[PDB]
Amino acid sequence: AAKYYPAYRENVPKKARKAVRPTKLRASLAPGTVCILLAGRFRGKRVVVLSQLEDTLVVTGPYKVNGVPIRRVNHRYVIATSAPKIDVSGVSVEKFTKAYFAKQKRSGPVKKDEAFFAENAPKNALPAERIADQKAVDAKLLPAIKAIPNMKEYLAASFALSNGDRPHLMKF
Amino acid sequence: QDEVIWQVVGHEFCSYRIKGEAQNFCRNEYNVTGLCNRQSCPLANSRYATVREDNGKLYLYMKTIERAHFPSKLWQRIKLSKNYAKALEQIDQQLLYWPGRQIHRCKQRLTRLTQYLLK
Amino acid sequence: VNIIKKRTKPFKRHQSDRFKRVGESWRKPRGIDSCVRRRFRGTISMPKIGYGNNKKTRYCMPNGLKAFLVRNVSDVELLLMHNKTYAAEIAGNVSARKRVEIVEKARALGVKVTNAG
Amino acid sequence: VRYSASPALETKCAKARGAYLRTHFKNSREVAFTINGMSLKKAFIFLDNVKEHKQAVPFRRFNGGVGRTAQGKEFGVTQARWPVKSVKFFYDLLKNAEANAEAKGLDMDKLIIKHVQVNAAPKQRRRTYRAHGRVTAYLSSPSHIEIIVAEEESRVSLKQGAKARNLAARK
Amino acid sequence: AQGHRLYVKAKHLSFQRSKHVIHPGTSIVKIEGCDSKEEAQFYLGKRVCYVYKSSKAVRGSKIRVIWGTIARPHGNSGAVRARFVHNLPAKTFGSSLRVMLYPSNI
RNA sequence: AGAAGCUCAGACGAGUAGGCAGGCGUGGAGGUUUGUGACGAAGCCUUGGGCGUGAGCCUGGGUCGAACAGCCUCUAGUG
RNA sequence: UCUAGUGGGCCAUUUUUGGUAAGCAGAACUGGCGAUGCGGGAUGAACCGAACGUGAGGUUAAGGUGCCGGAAUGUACGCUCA
RNA sequence: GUACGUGAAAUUGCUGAAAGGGAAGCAUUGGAAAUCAGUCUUAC
Numbered sequence: 053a054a055k056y057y058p059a060y061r062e063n064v065p066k067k068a069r070k071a072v073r074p075t076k077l078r079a080s081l082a083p084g085t086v087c088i089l090l091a092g093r094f095r096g097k098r099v100v101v102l103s104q105l106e107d108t109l110v111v112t113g114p115y116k117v118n119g120v121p122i123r124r125v126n127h128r129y130v131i132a133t134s135a136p137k138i139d140v141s142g143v144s145v146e147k148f149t150k151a152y153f154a155k156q157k158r159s160g161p162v163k164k165d166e167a168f169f170a171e172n173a174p175k176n177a178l179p180a181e182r183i184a185d186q187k188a189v190d191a192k193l194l195p196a197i198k199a200i201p202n203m204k205e206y207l208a209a210s211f212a213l214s215n216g217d218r219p220h221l222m223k224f
Numbered sequence: 225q226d227e228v229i230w231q232v233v234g235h236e237f238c239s240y241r242i243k244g245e246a247q248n249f250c251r252n253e254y255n256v257t258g259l260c261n262r263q264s265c266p267l268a269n270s271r272y273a274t275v276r277e278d279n280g281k282l283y284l285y286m287k288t289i290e291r292a293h294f295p296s297k298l299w300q301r302i303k304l305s306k307n308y309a310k311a312l313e314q315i316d317q318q319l320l321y322w323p324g325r326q327i328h329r330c331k332q333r334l335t336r337l338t339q340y341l342l343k
Numbered sequence: 344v345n346i347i348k349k350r351t352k353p354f355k356r357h358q359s360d361r362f363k364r365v366g367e368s369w370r371k372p373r374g375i376d377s378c379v380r381r382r383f384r385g386t387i388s389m390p391k392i393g394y395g396n397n398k399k400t401r402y403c404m405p406n407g408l409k410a411f412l413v414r415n416v417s418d419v420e421l422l423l424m425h426n427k428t429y430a431a432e433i434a435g436n437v438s439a440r441k442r443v444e445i446v447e448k449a450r451a452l453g454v455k456v457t458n459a460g
Numbered sequence: 461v462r463y464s465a466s467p468a469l470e471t472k473c474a475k476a477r478g479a480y481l482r483t484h485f486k487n488s489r490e491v492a493f494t495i496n497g498m499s500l501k502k503a504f505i506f507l508d509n510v511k512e513h514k515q516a517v518p519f520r521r522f523n524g525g526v527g528r529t530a531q532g533k534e535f536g537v538t539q540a541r542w543p544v545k546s547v548k549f550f551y552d553l554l555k556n557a558e559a560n561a562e563a564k565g566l567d568m569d570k571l572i573i574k575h576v577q578v579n580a581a582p583k584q585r586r587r588t589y590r591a592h593g594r595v596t597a598y599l600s601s602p603s604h605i606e607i608i609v610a611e612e613e614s615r616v617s618l619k620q621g622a623k624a625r626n627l628a629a630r631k
Numbered sequence: 632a633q634g635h636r637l638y639v640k641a642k643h644l645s646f647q648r649s650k651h652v653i654h655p656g657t658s659i660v661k662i663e664g665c666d667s668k669e670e671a672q673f674y675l676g677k678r679v680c681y682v683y684k685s686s687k688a689v690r691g692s693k694i695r696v697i698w699g700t701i702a703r704p705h706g707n708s709g710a711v712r713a714r715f716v717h718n719l720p721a722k723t724f725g726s727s728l729r730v731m732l733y734p735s736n737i
Numbered sequence: 738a739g740a741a742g743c744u745c746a747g748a749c750g751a752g753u754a755g756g757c758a759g760g761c762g763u764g765g766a767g768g769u770u771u772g773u774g775a776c777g778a779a780g781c782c783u784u785g786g787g788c789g790u791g792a793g794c795c796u797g798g799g800u801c802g803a804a805c806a807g808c809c810u811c812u813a814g815u816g
Numbered sequence: 817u818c819u820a821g822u823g824g825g826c827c828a829u830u831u832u833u834g835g836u837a838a839g840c841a842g843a844a845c846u847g848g849c850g851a852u853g854c855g856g857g858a859u860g861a862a863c864c865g866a867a868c869g870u871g872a873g874g875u876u877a878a879g880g881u882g883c884c885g886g887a888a889u890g891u892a893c894g895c896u897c898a
Numbered sequence: 899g900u901a902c903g904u905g906a907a908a909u910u911g912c913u914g915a916a917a918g919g920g921a922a923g924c925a926u927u928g929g930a931a932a933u934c935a936g937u938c939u940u941a942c
Contacts, residue, residue, distance in 0.1 A: 055308050056339060059332040059424045078736065090733045093619075095637055128734035161939055169621040212634045218664035219639060219732060220673035234739065237809040239769065241739090242421060244412070244807075245794085246402070248739050249421045251770095258424045260739050336423050336452070343451040349870055352925095354791065360923055363908075369791055375753075382751085382853045382868080384652075387925060393750085393869030394790040402788060405936050410787065412795065414773055414807085432787090435796060436773050436805080457787070458796055461899095464912055480901085489911070496912090577912045582901075604911090614691045646927085648886050649855080655927040656872095659886075685930075697929090706887050720929040751868050753851040755821045781906065784915100786935060790870090801904065 075107050077127050083145075086135040086203075087111065087125075088211045088224065094120050096210040099130075100138050100193060103145035110148040114193050115186050117207045122186060124153050131211075133224045136200055143192040147185070230268035234260060238267075254285050254299065256329045264329075273323055275315065275330050277337045281305050284318060284330075308338050346400040346407065354390045404430065410457050415441060419448040430455040463606055465575045473574065473610040474561035476553045480581050481603050486522035487543035488578040488603040491550050494518055494535070500558060500571040500609055507554070510547050516540035517547070549605065557609045567611060574610035578603050638729040639663065641679065643719055647705075647712060655721070659705055660713045662730055671704035671711050678731045679713050681723060701730070 081087070081101060087109070089097045097120050099113035109127055113120035171177065197203045213219070233241075240252035241260050248260035254274045257264040266272055270289040275282060282304040291298045302318075304311050311334055319327045354369045357379045369390060372380035379386040395401075402409050408430035413419055414437055422429050431449045433442055433456065449456050461477070468475045481488075494517050495503050509515035516531035523539045532540035554573075561571060581602035588598040616624065641662040646653045660679065665671055681697045689695055699715030713728075 056335045057332060058427075059336055060427055061328075090637055090731065090735060093623075096635070128736075131732060131735050131737055164615065164618075164621075169618075169625045172622065173625070210634055211637070213636050213639070214633055216664075219737070220665070220670050224737065230739095235741065237769065242770080242808075243739095250739090251417065251421055258421065261742080262740090263738060265739090333424060336426070339453060340423075340451050350790080355924090358923090368793075371791090380753095384854070385925065390791040391869055392790060393871090395870080396790080404787065410795070412807090415771095417771080432796065434773070434806095436778065438774070439776055441773085441776095460797080466913090485911085492911085575912075579911050580909090606912095614688065616691060620691070645886075650880090650885060652855090653886090653927080683929085687931080706881085707890080708888075710887090715928095718928045721927075722929070749869100751852065751854105756819085780904075784933075 077104050077109075078132065080132040081109060081127055081130070082137070084137040084140040086133045086138070086207070087130040088133060089120075089125060089130060091129045092125075094123075096212055098133075098207050098209065098211060099125070100140070100197075100207065102140055102143065102189065103148060105148070106150060110145065110153075112186070112189065113207050114190050114197070116190050116194065117197070117204060118210075122148065122182075122189065131224050135203065135206065138193060138200075138203075139196045140193070143189050226268050226270055227262075230262045230265055233267060234262065234265060240266075254287070256326060256333050271322065273319055273326055273330060275333045275337065277340055280341055282311055282334065282337060282341075284315060286318070286322070308334070311338065344397070344399050346403050346405055347397065349394050349396055355387070357387055404457070406430070406455075408455060413445055413449075416444055416448045419445055419452060419454065422449075422454045423452055426452055426454045430457050432457045433459075463575075463608060464577050465608060467574055467610055468608050470564065472566065473608055474557050474564055474566060474571075475606065475608040476557035476560060477607075478549065478553050478603075478605040481549050481605060482584075482600065483545045483549055483603060484543070485578060485580050485601045485603040487517075487541075487546040488549070488605060490519050490522060490541075491517050491543060491546045492576045492578045492605070493520065495550065495573055496576050498573060500554065500568070500573060503554060503573055504551070507547050507551050510542050511544055511551075513542055516542055549603075550607075553605055553607050554609075557607050561609060566609075570611045571609045572611070573607065575608035576606070578605050580604070638731050639674075641728040641730045643681070643723045643726050643728055644710065645724055646721070655718045656714070657702065658699075658713045658715065658719050660701070660711050660728060660730075662709065662711060665709035665711070667709050668704040668707060671701075671709055673737075674701050674711060674730060675703065676734060677701045678733055679715075680729050680731070681715070681719055681726070682729060 081104065083101050083103055085101045087099050087101055089095055089099060094113075097113055097118055099111045099118075099120055101109050101111045102122070103110045104127075105124060107126065108124040109130065110122065111125050111130075112122040115121055194204075197207060238260075240250055240255070242249040242251060249258055250260040250264070250266075251258070252266045253276065254266040254272070255264060256274050262268055264272075266274065270287070270292065272287065274285045276285070277283075284302045284304065286300045287298050302314075304314055312331055315330050315334055316327060319330065353367070355367050356365060356370050357372055357377070359365045359367050371389070374380060379389065382389075404410060409428060410432040411422060411429040412434055413422075413431045414434045419431055422431060431445070431454045433445050437445065446456060446459055449459075463475060463477075467473055495506065498506065506515055510517055514531075515534075516529055517540055518532050518535040518537040519526045519539045519541055520537065526539040526541055528538045529540050532538055558568065558571070561568065581604050584600040584602065586598035586600065587595055589595055639662055641660050644659045644661050646655045647657045647659060648654060662671075662674055665674060677700070679699045679701055681699075682694060683696075684693055685695055686693075697715055697717050697719065699713050699719075702712045702714050704710070705712045
């Protein structure tokens with residue numbers, strides 16, 4: 053059969069009984085909710101939830117408001133706010149999947165270069181289709197935040213804690 | 225009698241036994257596993273087979289119960305000089321009836337020798 | 344199964360730090376008033392069988408192999424079928440000629456050498 | 461015999477040795493510690509001053525019972541002495557080292573005492589007679605001295621790289 | 632400059648200990664504004680860290696961090712027990728810690 | 738499946754005087770290993786590595802210059 | 817069946833004798849220390865709790881939670897001024 | 899190099915580093931600084 057069999061009878065793992073079942077996200081993370089990003093490069097940003105993915109939330113604060121593109125954000129790194137909901141029923145969310153946000157496979161330890169960092173960037177890498185999707189979701193999201201007062205600039209601002217603020221007493 | 229041999233040579237002095245501090249290795253020129261054990265004991269098993277390397281050529285050794293008194297014709301030699309696959313089917317064929325479970329061990333041994341030969 | 348060490352620091356003999364005539368090698372305190380023998384709080388611990396390591400990971404190097412001492416090529420060929428269980432370790436009294444010969448023997452076997460360099 | 465220190469490379473140095481010299485090892489150590497690091501010419505000026513009681517050798521380690529003096533203040537110490545036997549030996553060795561540098565072709569203006577060490581030589585021993593018919597040791601502590609004179613004396617993560625590029629290059 | 636600090640300020644009080652025996656594996660942390668165990672329940676499971684500064688540049692950074700998690704409340708006055716990946720140095724008694732707002736559930 | 742092996746389960750674990758058991762180390766003897774060695778044995782030094790609960794053991798580098806070791810048994814002026 | 821060590825004990829509870837009394841002398845029953853660390857009583861051989869393989873988590877005992885010191889400058893009702 | 903094979907420890911000097919308010923040593927946990935191996939890179 054095969055060539056050059058190992059000199060050790062392989063130990064097959066016992067059949068595991070761990071079945072993957074759908075994640076039950078927080079009851080306050082409904083689509084269209086305004087959320088606060090706690091970690092990452094966009095910590096303190098305010099964003100509008102588009103859809104709930106398998107584990108995380110596909111979310112973007114309108115790129116023309118605060119410059120946060122469409123990203124997956126894990127539901128444990130957001131503080132959902134009680135701000136008035138934004139209509140996200142009219143925006144397509146079926147094309148935002150794990151495959152859509154998936155990175156390129158590497159399967160090797162070679163990486164890193166000054167030219168590598170000169171590569172990627174918004175100028176390169178960023179597909180025109182990704183830019184078009186960001187512009188399309190912006191077109192479908194801006195009218196709602198324009199209509200409800202003070203929410204456009206609220207999304208532009210950045211959340212921060214001040215002296216004497218106690219998050220357990222504070223509600224968002 | 226075969227058990228007498230093992231009780232004499234297995235647990236104590238043997239020229240092919242290498243005891244170090246917690247374990248036993250069997251370098252015997254007609255063993256496959258490399259470890260010391262009756263099931264694999266070459267001297268104490270009357271019907272048993274092995275493979276070893278020689279000058280780029282693989283050799284399979286066998287011995288029976290009939291020729292025990294004559295050491296010169298006691299072991300039987302065959303030489304192999306082909307690729308691995310065919311070398312496997314030879315041991316498979318030569319042992320599909322003879323040892324019981326040495327088929328897999330000498331397939332493993334032939335594996336390691338052929339990696340030696342290529343290197 | 345990864346290798347876990349119940350204890351990493353050696354059991355140094357009591358008062359070996361204060362007296363040079365008393366060596367680091369562990370000696371069991373027989374003294375009638377010995378604080379360490381009586382296990383006072385704050386004193387040094389003593390070797391116990393509870394400190395023994397897992398039978399699966401005992402005698403195993405951090406890479407999972409067991410360093411098997413090697414003095415000639417025939418010692419290397421003993422590890423022909425156990426190249427994922429043992430690692431060749433060339434003895435200190437082996438000359439440079441056999442050291443090179445053992446290294447090429449072990450690299451042919453695919454057996455790792457702990458002190459190849 | 462080889463010296464203690466990595467220098468004594470004969471291209472740019474000189475050295476001089478003395479063995480079994482019958483003078484006190486403790487006084488020799490104090491002299492060596494005092495002269496270690498100063499230039500050869502200024503070392504000679506200091507040694508003549510010690511011989512003339514114009515400067516004193518500070519006693520730092522073996523100072524038990526050593527009297528106080530005003531000539532120790534330039535070394536920030538109170539205890540200092542004028543060991544003339546030890547200084548005479550050190551003067552002879554320094555002259556020998558200077559002669560070695562002369563024959564070797566070095567520069568006398570720039571030479572400094574790079575290394576000087578005193579070691580205990582084997583004790584010669586003698587007898588002294590005590591009260592009640594008792595005898596004990598009258599040991600002598602010689603010194604080995606050696607002197608050497610010489611001349612002169614990151615990877616970045618993907619996020620870090622992108623942050624650095626977008627901040628520095630883009631602006 | 633008040634557009635940052637997504638964390639809550641806390642102070643490393645001591646190790647978890649009896650009268651004479653210390654247990655450096657877990658520490659006692661006083662989170663500011665946390666004045667009862669009922670309030671400590673909100674901070675349970677948050678990500679706490681010790682941030683300090685060093686002269687050597689590890690990966691081009693002067694700032695290095697030891698991470699940890701709030702495990703349980705301690706006492707009645709709002710102090711919490713914290714477990715760190717590296718046990719906090721005993722010289723940090725009275726030093727400050729950052730308690731982030733994640734993993735969030737609010 | 739070195740059946741003197743492999744495997745499953747449960748309970749349990751302080752200790753002077755003292756008893757018993759299994760191991761580590763040393764000198765010499767028989768057997769053995771196509772055993773190591775002037776291309777460096779033994780010994781010694783070591784802010785190198787590795788193993789063992791431990792007695793200990795192995796190893797890298799340095800020094801050194803003539804012998805020494807593993808295993809099975811025998812023995813003792815053996816720690 | 818063979819044999820080791822031992823054949824100076826001491827303390828406490830309770831009962832009790834000699835005694836002016838004693839950190840005194842003498843016994844009875846049990847528990848201990850001796851031979852035993854650990855938690856506590858600041859500290860202590862016999863007091864309190866608990867008797868010990870190497871560890872992780874949880875929970876308690878005795879005892880504590882103003883600060884040293886881990887833990888309420890807690891709750892309720894009084895007493896006390898020295 | 900005859901103060902002669904090998905050349906241990908005590909103890910000593912030099913150098914480098916470090917520490918130190920009436921001892922020092924130790925144990926435990928981590929920091930800092932120095933030092934270093936494994937692992938990996940591959941195999942299928």
